[PDB]
Write a protein that binds this ligand. Sequence first.
Ligand SMILES: C=C1/C(=C\C=C2/CCC[C@]3(C)C(C4(CCCC(C)(C)O)CC4)=CC[C@@H]23)C[C@@H](O)C[C@@H]1O
Lengths: 238, 10
Amino acid sequence: MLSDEQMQIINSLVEAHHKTYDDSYSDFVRFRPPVRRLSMLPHLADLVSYSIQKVIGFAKMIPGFRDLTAEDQIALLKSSAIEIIMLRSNQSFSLEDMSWSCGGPDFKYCINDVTKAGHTLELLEPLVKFQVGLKKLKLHEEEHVLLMAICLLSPDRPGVQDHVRIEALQDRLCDVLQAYIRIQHPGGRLLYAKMIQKLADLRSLNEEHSKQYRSLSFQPEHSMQLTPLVLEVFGSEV
Amino acid sequence: RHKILHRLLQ
Ligand SMILES: C=C1/C(=C\C=C2/CCC[C@]3(C)C(C4(CCCC(C)(C)O)CC4)=CC[C@@H]23)C[C@@H](O)C[C@@H]1O
């Protein structure tokens, strides 16, 4: 069975997620509205930007992340943000529609919408497959929130200097995730492995997004539509 | 640099 320290971690992560993710999607009305060249870029850039603030909120509540150096916290967040957003979005993804349904119809985004934000199927095809494989795992809340913390606390990111300390952290989280599935997930005999695979998938998705964002931000008529926080986090500044 | 990130990280 599980120890008090491990379920203490689980308690923190779940609450962290509950503060930083608002099932009412009511804040969305304050983004630049969706429009349907590059008509969806302003609403979606405002969407991502808001999500980055949520992830930073979540990150700060991961036990230990706070006690990292500020460079390391930056490096983790800069390289992992697009991955955590892609993860957390799975909560708003529907297999019926194959789209992210955030409350109202104007906050329902399909693949076609995201192409109107300057993105190709070379990214959207694997992303939505990823969302489908991820939804089929039927993750518990605990499992979903652990994987975001494991993804964010990867020491194999560009920029990280305290590689030891972050692998220590990430390790303790996998022990929890492995022991949670074993003891709290019936039929989870293979679930940890396929959660690890979903991480490898996120590295590919990151890569493809990184490529497609570079072209997006090398055209000022499009990068002017992004937000300062998006440009800072996806910026290549060191 | 990373002016906003430093801020958001208290
Ligand atoms: C945000 C989130 C949500 C959805 C995430 C989406 C839907 C549209 C496509 C998004 C935005 C993408 C793209 C567009 C990226 C646009 C840009 C940053 C300008 O290159 C990569 C397809 C990645 C995650 C996707 C809603 C809610 O689940 C909160 C979550 O936190």
